[PDB]
Amino acid sequence: TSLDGLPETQKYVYADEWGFSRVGADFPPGSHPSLFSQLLPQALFAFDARAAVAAVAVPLAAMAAGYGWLWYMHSIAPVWQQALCAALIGTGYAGLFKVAHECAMMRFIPQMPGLQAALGTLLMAPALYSLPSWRLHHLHHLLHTNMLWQDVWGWHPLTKVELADEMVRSGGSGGAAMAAARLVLTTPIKLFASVGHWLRSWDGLDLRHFHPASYVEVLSGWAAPLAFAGLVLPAVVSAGGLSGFVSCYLAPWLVFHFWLSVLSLTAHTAPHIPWRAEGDGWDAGRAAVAGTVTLRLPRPLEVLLNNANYMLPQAVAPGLPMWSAPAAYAVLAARLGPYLTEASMSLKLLTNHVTRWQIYDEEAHTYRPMEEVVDEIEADLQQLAAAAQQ
Amino acid sequence: TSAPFISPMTPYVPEEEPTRTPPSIKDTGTLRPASEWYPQWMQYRRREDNYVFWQDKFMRCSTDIPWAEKRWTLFSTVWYLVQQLRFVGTPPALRYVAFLGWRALMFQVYAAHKALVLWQCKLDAGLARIGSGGATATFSKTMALRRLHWRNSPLAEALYALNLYKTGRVHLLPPVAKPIPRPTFFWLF
Amino acid sequence: SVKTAWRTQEVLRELSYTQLWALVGEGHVARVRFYGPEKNKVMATTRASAPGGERLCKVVLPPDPELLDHLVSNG
Amino acid sequence: WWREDDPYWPLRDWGDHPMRWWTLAFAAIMAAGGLATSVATGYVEPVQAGLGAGALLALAGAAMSDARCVPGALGVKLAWAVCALIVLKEVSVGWQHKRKRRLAASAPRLELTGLAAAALCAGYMLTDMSGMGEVALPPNPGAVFKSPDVAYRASVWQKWGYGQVQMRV
Amino acid sequence: AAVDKAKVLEDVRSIISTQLGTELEKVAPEAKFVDLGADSLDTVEIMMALEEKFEIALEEEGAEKIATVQDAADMIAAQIAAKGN
Ligand SMILES: CC(C)CCC[C@@H](C)[C@H]1CC[C@H]2[C@@H]3CC=C4C[C@@H](OC(=O)CCC(=O)O)CC[C@]4(C)[C@H]3CC[C@]12C
Numbered sequence: 092t093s094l095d096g097l098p099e100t101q102k103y104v105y106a107d108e109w110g111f112s113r114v115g116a117d118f119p120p121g122s123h124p125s126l127f128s129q130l131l132p133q134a135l136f137a138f139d140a141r142a143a144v145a146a147v148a149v150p151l152a153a154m155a156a157g158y159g160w161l162w163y164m165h166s167i168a169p170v171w172q173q174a175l176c177a178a179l180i181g182t183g184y185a186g187l188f189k190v191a192h193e194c195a196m197m198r199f200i201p202q203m204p205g206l207q208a209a210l211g212t213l214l215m216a217p218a219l220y221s222l223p224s225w226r227l228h229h230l231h232h233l234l235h236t237n238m239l240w241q242d243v244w245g246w247h248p249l250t251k252v253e254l255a256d257e258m259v260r261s262g263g264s265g266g267a268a269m270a271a272a273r274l275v276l277t278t279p280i281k282l283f284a285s286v287g288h289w290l291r292s293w294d295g296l297d298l299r300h301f302h303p304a305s306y307v308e309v310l311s312g313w314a315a316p317l318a319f320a321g322l323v324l325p326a327v328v329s330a331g332g333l334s335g336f337v338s339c340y341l342a343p344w345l346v347f348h349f350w351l352s353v354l355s356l357t358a359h360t361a362p363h364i365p366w367r368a369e370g371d372g373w374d375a376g377r378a379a380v381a382g383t384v385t386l387r388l389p390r391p392l393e394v395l396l397n398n399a400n401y402m403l404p405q406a407v408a409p410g411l412p413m414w415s416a417p418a419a420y421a422v423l424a425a426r427l428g429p430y431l432t433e434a435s436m437s438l439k440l441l442t443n444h445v446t447r448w449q450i451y452d453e454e455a456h457t458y459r460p461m462e463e464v465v466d467e468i469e470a471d472l473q474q475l476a477a478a479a480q481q
Numbered sequence: 482t483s484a485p486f487i488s489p490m491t492p493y494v495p496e497e498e499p500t501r502t503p504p505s506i507k508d509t510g511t512l513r514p515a516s517e518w519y520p521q522w523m524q525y526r527r528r529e530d531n532y533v534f535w536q537d538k539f540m541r542c543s544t545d546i547p548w549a550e551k552r553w554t555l556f557s558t559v560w561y562l563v564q565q566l567r568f569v570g571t572p573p574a575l576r577y578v579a580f581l582g583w584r585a586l587m588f589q590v591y592a593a594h595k596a597l598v599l600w601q602c603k604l605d606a607g608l609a610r611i612g613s614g615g616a617t618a619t620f621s622k623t624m625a626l627r628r629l630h631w632r633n634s635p636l637a638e639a640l641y642a643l644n645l646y647k648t649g650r651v652h653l654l655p656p657v658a659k660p661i662p663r664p665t666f667f668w669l670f
Numbered sequence: 671s672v673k674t675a676w677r678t679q680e681v682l683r684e685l686s687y688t689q690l691w692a693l694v695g696e697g698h699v700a701r702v703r704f705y706g707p708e709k710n711k712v713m714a715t716t717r718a719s720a721p722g723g724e725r726l727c728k729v730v731l732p733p734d735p736e737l738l739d740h741l742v743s744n745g
Numbered sequence: 746w747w748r749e750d751d752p753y754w755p756l757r758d759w760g761d762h763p764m765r766w767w768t769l770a771f772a773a774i775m776a777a778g779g780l781a782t783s784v785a786t787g788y789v790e791p792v793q794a795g796l797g798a799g800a801l802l803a804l805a806g807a808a809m810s811d812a813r814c815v816p817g818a819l820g821v822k823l824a825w826a827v828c829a830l831i832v833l834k835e836v837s838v839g840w841q842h843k844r845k846r847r848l849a850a851s852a853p854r855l856e857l858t859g860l861a862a863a864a865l866c867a868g869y870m871l872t873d874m875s876g877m878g879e880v881a882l883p884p885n886p887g888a889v890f891k892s893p894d895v896a897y898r899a900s901v902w903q904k905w906g907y908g909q910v911q912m913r914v
Numbered sequence: 915a916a917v918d919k920a921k922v923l924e925d926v927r928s929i930i931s932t933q934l935g936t937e938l939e940k941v942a943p944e945a946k947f948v949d950l951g952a953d954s955l956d957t958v959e960i961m962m963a964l965e966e967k968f969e970i971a972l973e974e975e976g977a978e979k980i981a982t983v984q985d986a987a988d989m990i991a992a993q994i995a996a997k998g999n
Contacts, residue, residue, distance in 0.1 A: 296769070296807040298816075299760060303483075306816055310808055321800030328780075329674070329789035494758075495813065500875050506997065510971050521969045522994045525922055530915050533998025549875070553882040595962065602955060623974040625958050630971060637756060644752040655753050662875035666822065668882050673788050677841035723846030 092118055092381050093365040093456050105363070110440040114363055115381050116429035122376030128408040131422055135415045142414035143200065146397045150186030153179055153395060158339070166334065173338060181346020182395055184218070188347060189397045191215045193413050195226045198405075212312075216319045218347060221312040223305075224292050233406070237359065237378035239368035244288075246356055248366055248451035248458070249276070255468050264465065276449055277461060282441065283345065285352035350396070353441070357386055357434065358402050362448060365456040379406060380430060385420070387435040393417075403431075500549040500663035506537040510630040513591040514584050549663055556670035598628050605645060613649025621651055634658045682713070683727040690714060690729045697744050700724075762809040762817065764868050768824050771865060772802035778858070788842040794834075801827045818876030825869045828862040835859035917995045923987045929967050930983060933960045944982050970994060 094102065095117050102114040157179040161168070168176075193199040194211035201207075212222050228244040235242040239250075249272070261268055275281060293313065294300045301309050328336050364382040367373045386400045393400075401416035404423065411419055424431060434440060448458035482488040507515045523531050567576075606620040624641070627633055633641075637655035644653060664670070685693075690712075693699050698720035703713045712729045716722070731737060748754055779795015782788075801823060808820030839853030855863075886905055889898040895914070902908060923943065931938040934951050941950060947957045957980070964986065965972055970993045980986050 295810075296803065297810045298807070299810055303811075303814070306811065306814060310804070310816060313807055314804065317800045317804055321796050325789075325793040325796045328783070328792055332787075333784050500878075507969075509965065509969055511965075513966070516969060521967070522997060525918055525991075525994055526997075527916050530998070536998070549878055551888070552878065553884065553888075555882075599955070599959070602958065606955075619954065622958055622961065622977050622980075626961070626972060626974045626977055629962065634756075637753070640753050640756070643747070647747070648749060648752075653752070656756055661871060662873055664870045664874040665876070665878045666825070666874065667877075667880050672841075672844070675841065676790050677838055677844070679838055718846045720846075723844075723851070724848035 092377065094363045102363075109362065109443060110434060110437045111361070111363075111384075112387070112433035112435055113431060115432045118377045118381040118430055120374045120377060122374070124376050124379040124407055125409075126376065126407075127380075127423070127427065130426055131408060131411075131419055135419050135422075136408075136411060137415070138200075138202070138412065139414070146413060147187065147190050150183035150395055150397065153183030153186070154343075155183075157183065161339065166338065173342070177338075177342035178346055180343040181350065182392070184343055184347045185350040185399060186395050186397045187214050188218060188351075189399045189413070191220075191222075192225070192229075195222050196229070196409065198410050198412060212315050216315045217323075218344070219289065219316045219320060221292060221309075221316055223309055223312040224294070228292070233409070236375075236406075237364065237366055237382045238373055239366050241369070246360055248360070250366075251450065251452050251454075251464070251468070254450065254464075255471070258468060258472065264469075273461065273465075277445070279441075279445060281445060282353055282356075283348055285348045285355070288352075289348070350399075354386075354399060356444060357440065358384055358400070360384075360444070360448065360458075361432065362457045363432070366451060366453075380427065384432045384434055387433065498549075499547050502541050502545075502547065502550065505541060506534065510632075511591060512587060512594055514587055517584075549665070552665065554668055554670050595629070598625060601628060605642070608642065609645040609649050609651050612646040613651075615649075617649055617651060619651055621654065624654060627654075627657075632658050680725075683725060685714070685727045685729045687729065687732060690727070690731075691740075693720070694741055694744055699741075699744070702741065760811060760813065762812045762821060763872050764821075764824075764865070765806055765809050767865065767868065768802050768806035768809060771828075771861060772799040772806065774861075775799045775802065775858075782842065786842050790841045798827060798831060812873070815877075821869055821874055822877070825866055825874060828865040828869075831862040832859050832866065835862075915995060917991045919987065919991050922991045922994070923984075925967065926964065926983055926987045926990065929963055930960060933963055941983060943984050943987075946981050947983075964990060968994065970997075 092115070094105065094114065106112065106114050157176045161173075161176045164172075190199065191211045191214040194207040195215075197204065197207070199207050199210075208222070215222050215225070232242055232244045236245070254272075257268060258264065264270075275284065296313065298306050298309060324340070327340060331339065359382070361382075361384055364384075367378070380403070383403055383406070385403055388396070388400055398413055398416040401420055404416045404419040405411045407423070408419065447460055449461035450459050450464040451457070452459055452464070484493070504510070505515075507520045509515070520534075523534065602620045602625050605624070606618055609617055609619070624633075628638075633655060637658065641655055644650060690699070693714075693716065698716050699714055700717035701715045705711050705713065710731050710733065712731055714727045714729055716725055716727070718724055775795045776799030777795075779792045779799070783790070783792030783795070805820045805824035805827070808816040809824070811817045836853055836855050836859055839851070843851070845851040883904070884901055886898075886902050886907060889901045892898050895912070898914075899908075899912065902910065902912075927938060927941050927943070930936075930941050930950070934941075934956075936950055947960075952960070961972060961977060961980075968990055970990065972989065972993065976989050980989065
């Protein structure tokens with residue numbers, strides 16, 4: 092809660108300035124994000140075979156159609172046809188990956204835990220992701236949602252005092268670190284920053300970060316990815332050459348990583364959402380429901396990605412199945428309507444994420460552009476130097 | 482403190498059974514051979530206290546063998562052929578001549594190693610001068626003895642050379658080298 | 671092909687009769703040895719410049735009398 | 746680097762095998778060389794060998810991160826096995842992409858990667874490979890001849906096919 | 915265990931004498947090592963000769979604090995004392 096209670100007219104003009112479909116109402120402290128799970132009917136937690144098999148076999152068919160189309164004209168295709176096939180395959184794999192992320196939290200087919208764990212491992216493998224490290228990081232996210240200095244497995248924002256500290260530690264903005272930060276948080280490569288998250292899994296490939304009674308499970312978790320990049324990745328190259336690798340593997344990879352990064356970045360970032368450190372005003376239900384955003388999709392994309400944008404219906408109910416995530420949302424707006432936040436697909440939203448909302452300041456408790464912030468903390472350096480000439 | 486019940490101020494490091502038999506009682510840690518029947522120290526103790534010679538013999542030969550020296554592997558069943566050649570297929574006279582030659586060679590090797598150790602102590606005393614810059618031309622007898630008894634790993638002497646050349650501190654020495662265990666793989670070796 | 675295989679402990683290739691005939695005609699065979707209990711098996715070693723480099727082939731020479739002049743002609 | 750308050754920071758027990766960053770370094774070097782050479786030539790063997798070696802050595806260097814446990818021992822085992830197989834293939838069969846027309850020049854000698862793999866096997870053996878020492882060939886009736894226990898010896902005889910021989914012992 | 919310090923002291927004196935070139939009755943049981951014609955890179959050679967004569971290994975810290983032939987003899991006697999155990 093940052094731009095909390097004031098007339099709804101200015102929050103609506105803010106929502107139109109930012110492309111947001113709504114801005115939340117006031118939320119009082121002392122609540123549990125599991126509370127509002129008592130509202131949903133006792134049939135929203137139901138199990139059925141047809142919906143799940145559709146959710147797994149539809150993006151599969153998308154990917155298969157894209158591959159068949161490509162292998163039909165393997166490398167004689169032009170550039171934008173290649174881009175179309177890459178986007179289609181990456182979207183199908185994002186859907187399959189959401190099925191994976193479902194069976195990782197044990198809420199896909201609880202009837203067969205072994206079969207569902209094997210399915211999650213198999214479907215995470217082609218993206219080079221270990222199932223148990225993913226599960227640990229996602230629970231560690233849920234526990235610290237929107238907490239400062241604590242949720243590093245989400246989109247932890249870069250704050251002001253730390254950037255001034257690095258400014259002094261590098262001796263100006265001309266070092267490698269400052270230039271890297273600028274170039275990564277200013278250009279559309281930010282929309283692919285999830286790649287860096289993939290390099291923060293494999294926690295140094297170090298079992299000293301885990302609980303001993305889990306070692307044999309963590310290593311097997313690092314096995315299915317490695318084995319893949321040890322067996323299949325060669326074969327492809329062997330049978331396709333360098334170009335034949337940049338086509339059938341790397342581009343769908345960048346597509347899936349784009350989808351992942353933008354989903355998360357738009358789900359938990361907004362100027363009307365503050366990032367408090369706990370002790371200095373944090374709360375579970377507040378930073379859960381009030382500091383969140385839900386995005387809108389075309390129903391084709393929603394049946395492809397398998398409800399990949401409904402993150403709150405399963406943050407109030409961690410055991411809510413996947414084919415019921417829209418329906419549950421239907422109930423939630425009926426109850427917490429004024430406090431919800433919503434948004435849609437718009438290149439304007441992404442452009443504001445790229446150019447406007449770049450640095451988080453805790454004084455105004457909101458996001459600011461990076462060049463203005465950098466010139467102004469250079470001005471504060473001028474200030475402290477003026478206090479230092481004598 | 483992963484230990485639920487008891488956690489002394491020093492962490493528990495597990496102990497495991499040894500993998501090789503100790504040096505006999507008679508040999509020095511160095512390269513020079515031994516007195517070949519009776520050690521020289523046996524002469525400065527009471528007759529009733531030198532049962533440790535024959536006791537150490539009984540131990541290394543029959544009584545405490547570490548169960549890692551009785552592993553049957555594909556490598557040991559060919560080393561058996563080699564050793565049985567040496568012990569049953571050769572006449573003791575040629576064995577004796579080879580023994581004498583080997584003793585002489587090892588004595589010369591030890592003399593060379595001692596000379597090299599002395600030269601090393603000079604060089605390190607010389608380099609600690611550049612290091613600390615000032616007065617200390619000194620070395621440590623500790624490091625000379627540890628070099629003569631092969632108690633340092635190469636990384637240790639490298640770190641020590643750097644530490645001398647940068648800060649002097651000729652009395653700050655690497656911790657120690659720990660004993661190498663006996664390599665095992667599987668039925669292979 | 672030689673680009674889609676693993677190097678494995680090079681063995682004696684096999685030629686029937688005419689690949690060897692064409693090879694001795696083109697001047698690339700460098701040496702031949704006779705063996706067999708029936709005096710008709712040949713091990714043929716080619717020379718460097720030949721297509722494929724120096725290698726070893728195995729050939730069974732069906733009894734034809736104009737082979738001798740053929741080999742001795744091409745060195 | 747250097748730390749003037751304790752220069753001997755590496756020679757301190759951190760909980761992992763000493764030859765641990767060498768395993769990962771060699772896996773990275775192997776995968777990089779595999780990809781580089783197999784794209785710059787067109788042969789399919791070097792990249793397959795390099796990526797397999799890299800993946801197995803990376804898994805080994807992961808399990809070697811807790812040297813007290815049992816995985817910390819099976820890791821060094823796997824690493825030694827892989828580097829030994831590399832040395833073997835190099836010095837006995839050579840590399841496919843290093844074939845030439847002559848027959849004495851295209852013969853297998855020991856090149857750089859084999860030397861590095863051999864240094865790795867030696868460094869593994871000289872550090873600690875003493876784990877899992879209860880796996881060997883089973884004992885004969887020749888090891889239980891003078892054993893002080895009758896049930897054990899009868900068991901061994903029975904297994905090796907001598908259950909009927911009389912134990913006048 | 916029970917070691918005869920007399921013999922050990924006699925032989926340490928003999929070894930020091932023979933090593934430096936000074937006559938045996940001049941090296942007193944309390945004569946230090948620099949006053950008897952030896953520097954720093956020569957108190958280590960006589961340490962090596964002592965180990966070679968008695969066939970034992972000198973502890974290193976105790977060898978950093980040797981200044982009188984008496985303490986040398988005492989270190990050697992303590993080494994020979996704890997041999998079987
Ligand atoms: C080459 C491609 C096509 C196949 C797949 C390769 C991956 C399995 C590799 C490539 C990048 C690697 C990562 C690159 C960097 C690191 C850090 C490195 O650990 C450290 O540096 C320790 C911490 C520190 O040094 O501070 C080893 C693990 C990790 C995550 C590596 C894990 C294995 C990764 C993901």
